[PDB]
Structures are given as structure tokens and as C-alpha cells.
Structure 1
Amino acid sequence: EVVNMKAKEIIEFIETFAPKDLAIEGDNIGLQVGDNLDKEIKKLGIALDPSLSVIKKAEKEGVDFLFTHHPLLKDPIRNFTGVIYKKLKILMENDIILYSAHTNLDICKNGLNDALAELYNLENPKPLYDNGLGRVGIFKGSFEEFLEITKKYIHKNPIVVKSKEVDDNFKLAVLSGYGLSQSSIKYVAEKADVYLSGDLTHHSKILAEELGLVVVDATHYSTEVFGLKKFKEFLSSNLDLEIISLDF
């Protein structure tokens, strides 16, 4: 039986899986665009980004509730022109609800970071940061086995900054999305031998090389979508509601 749900029921279910208070300070989570949460929902769409093409695709596929991992806006605005105008207009004239679980989806049990920790079967995993982001533990295997898993399940040509030789049973840190800032490299260099994340840039590569931290950039997109598919299939398994993905 596939059935219609009210928006508020979907939201309460998502927030049971990924409570809002797990979100780190200042993260723009929750209702992005919407008014009435009693709205009946026929079709739930899941996306990584609330991009313009995702929102156009939501309109085309008759999506009533659009879930995105990333918030619509990180920085507040007071004028509505260009792209943000095009996006809000499509959402508002179609009364499409836009809702986000961001770092709360990263941090929660079986969330985006746990999905990575489980894929690599990390021994005794711990949160990588104090705020609960990322996971770290021992990878029980060779660097090459880790690489093959990375290539088979996450991304084919990952960038490897092979700063040093890596022995079997090494400490592996994972962080879905963008974990490769300079300050993150410095912090993680103390906690792990290998750091798997996304969005490598030049100064961070150089730093990783100086510190002997092996960094694997399997992209921002892929390291999050892996967990986001698990999330989608979790929702499909529990809600009798048509659910589609839009940018994955």
C-alpha cells in the first residue's frame, strides 16, 4: 500500500532518526521553505543540494516534499533576485515544502558518518570531533584493501596524498563531505594515519604532506551520497509513501 502522509509526520519521523539538537551550533537545519505543515504529501524527494536544477526536477516530477541534506542558505539575505528568486518562486507557486537535516544527519546514529565507518568496518569507532562530526577507528587491513573498498563503493579515481607509507591495521578517520580544511588536517594528523573525506585544495595537500597525514579525497559529493542513499532506503522501508532521489 502506497499512501499520502502529512508533512508534519514526515518531519517527526526524520527528526526521530536525526534529532535537531544533534546539529552543531549555527547550522541552518529544519524547515527551509514552507508554511502549512498539515499539507498532504504524495511524493517525497531526496537531494544532496537544493540546487536550481534539483528544484526544477522536483517541480517536474511532482514532488510535494523536498528533503535536502544541505540548507538552502547558509548566509542570510534581505533581497530576492536572480537564482534565489527562481528557486523560491518554483517552491512557492507549487507549495513545495523544503526541509533539511544537515549536520544532525551527519552526526546521528547510522547517519552519514556512521555509514562510512560501517563500510570500512572500523574497529571500536569514536566520534572524530568533540561536536560529534566524523568517526575514527582502526582499519583492520592493508592500505590497498582500504583503497579498493573506496574505489568500489565510493568513488573510482580518488585523489591520494600519499604523505607516508601506511602499515596494516592503521588508524582511519572518515568525514563525509568537506573535512579537509587546513585546521582539520592539523587536528586529524594527531588522531589518524589516513583521512578519508572530500574537497581537497592546494594548501591543505601541502600541509598534509608536511605532517605525514595520508589524505584521500573521494569527493564531497560521493562521501555524502553513500550515506544519503542508506537514508533514502531507510525512509522507503518505513514510510508507505512514494520516494525518489533527485541529484543521485
Structure 2
Amino acid sequence: MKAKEIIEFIETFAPKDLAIEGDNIGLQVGDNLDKEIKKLGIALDPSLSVIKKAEKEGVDFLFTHHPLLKDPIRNFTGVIYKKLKILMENDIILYSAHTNLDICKNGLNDALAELYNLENPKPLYDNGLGRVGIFKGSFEEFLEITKKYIHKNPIVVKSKEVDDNFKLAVLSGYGLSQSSIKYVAEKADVYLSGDLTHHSKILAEELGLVVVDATHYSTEVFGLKKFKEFLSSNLDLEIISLDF
């Protein structure tokens, strides 16, 4: 398959216009997209060790969820120099689907919603991020699902008692900012996401919002694996994962 055909396939599943404003999605590093592709590698992060592993495994197309850079640069030294050197010497294409993969149907957030069998799920934010709906069961039933399918030991901020058939909000990745806690506290009883910090925990306790941190890594990798299997079933391509 040609690189531009892989890119079109991905953009059919997760359209570029779904990405929130300023999100650096699409081609990160690459020249010729008529290049033919024998081995695609998928990763959560375009980290130095992921890129080293890609070179070692003979990956020619590297797909990551997070962009290579959020902040623009005009100098090439240290780590970014090492990364680009490996990608350019091996002519490895680096392509990213970030918030457009979180938001799209059957994307990262939908995967979580599907896992918890959320009743009548709606988007958590107006831009499309996250899902919220009724969880048909008890809080403990919700915890056992999280522990078995997402993360063995989630941090639970038990701000209040939770009744059965509660409102559950999910957001894969970093959803536990202070501003998110205040917003979601008005929309849900329980909030499942990643990257909890001190001030957010205090805030969650004050608002009576139950927060479950199943980590940034695990809440995205769950959906990313399903996406990887989707790629495998539909492309006549060797596909491997590098950091999950």
C-alpha cells in the first residue's frame, strides 16, 4: 500500500476536521507519500525509545496518537535532533491522529463508552470530547470493569456515596484538569479519566464529584488497541504496536 492510501484510510475513520482548534494532527514528518508501505507501527507517543524501536523493527510508517511537537521550534538539537535523524535517515513517515481520534465515532472516547455500556451516550463537551451517560449498575460493578479491562489499580477519589444507575462521564487521556473537574461536576456523578493532580483532587472532593484516575496511558491504550485491530482486519499490511 502507498502511504497516502494509509493516510486516507485513517482520515476516513477519523476526519481531520473533528480535531479541536490548534491541534497538530496529520503529517508530522515525511516527504514522498507515494512511497509503498510494508510495515506500519502504531504507538501512543512519538517518544525517543518508540522511534528507536521503529527503526529496529523496520517500520516504514509510524502512526502515533500524540503529535511529535505541540510547541513549534526553530532549532534542532538534543532529543528532537535525535528523533528527526532516525526518522529521516530511514525515511520513516510519522503521522498523527490526536483529538480527531478521541472524538470520532468508535474512537477512543466511544470505546470507553462502549466498554461501560453507557445508556444513551452523549458527548461530554461541545467540541466532541468525552462521553457521558447512565451506567446501568452499581459503583462496585463499575470498579470491577475498570480494574479488569482498563487498569488494575485505579486511584479513586470517593467524594460522595454513589447510587446505582448513576451518570458516568469518561474522557480518555488528560481530562482531570481543574477546569474539567468544575465542568463535569455539573454533568455527572462519576468521572473516569487520567492524570490526576493535587489541586484537582481537592477540587473534586469539594464539588462532590467522584473521580477515578485509571491513568492517561491506560484510558487511551484501550481504544488504541481496538483501532490497531481495526487496521489489521482491513489493511493487507503487517501492523505492530511499539509502546503497548
Q: TM-score range by the shorter chain?
A: over 0.9
Tell whether 2:177 aligns with 1:181: yes
Note the C-alpha offset of 1:161: 0.1
Question: Structure 1 residue 189: deviation in Å?
Answer: 0.1
How far the C-alpha of 1:89 sits from its partner, in A, is 0.1
Task: After superposition, give the CA deviation of every residue in 1:143-198 in whole Å (9 maximum; x if it has no partner).
Answer: 00000000000000100000000000000000000000000000000000000000
Q: SS where residue 212 of structure 2 aligns?
A: strand
| Deviation, structure 1 residue 139 | 0.3
Output the CA distance in 2 between the equivalents of 1:103 and 1:56.
Answer: 25
CA distance in 1, matches of 2:229, 2:29: 24
Q: Deviations over 1:16-73 (max 9, x none)?
A: 0000000000000000000110011010000000000000000000000000000000
Q: Distance in 2 between matches of 1:46 and 1:153?
A: 20
Q: Percent identity, aligned pairs only?
A: 100
Counterpart for residue 229 of structure 1: 225
CA distance in 1, matches of 2:41, 2:137: 38
Q: Distance in 1 between matches of 2:96 and 2:162?
A: 38
Describe the SS at the equivalent of 2:142.
helix
Match of 1:130 in 2: 126
Deviation at 1:137, TM superposition (A): 0.1
Cα distance in 1 for residues equivalent to 2:90 and 2:235: 23
- Report the Cα distance in structure 1 between the residues aligned to 2:46 and 2:38, rounded to whole angstroms: 19
**Partner SS state of residue 168, structure 2:** strand
Instruction: Give me the whole-angstrom Cα distance separating, in 1, the residues matched to 2:19 and 2:126.
Output: 12
The CA deviation at 1:140 is 0.3
Structure-1 separation of matches of 2:19 and 2:90: 29
Partner residue of 2:11 out of 3, 10, 15 = 15
Q: Distance in 2 between matches of 1:239 and 1:18?
A: 16
TM-score by length of 2: 1.00
Unaligned residue ranges in structure 2 (runs of 5+): none
Q: Secondary structure at the match of 2:33?
A: coil
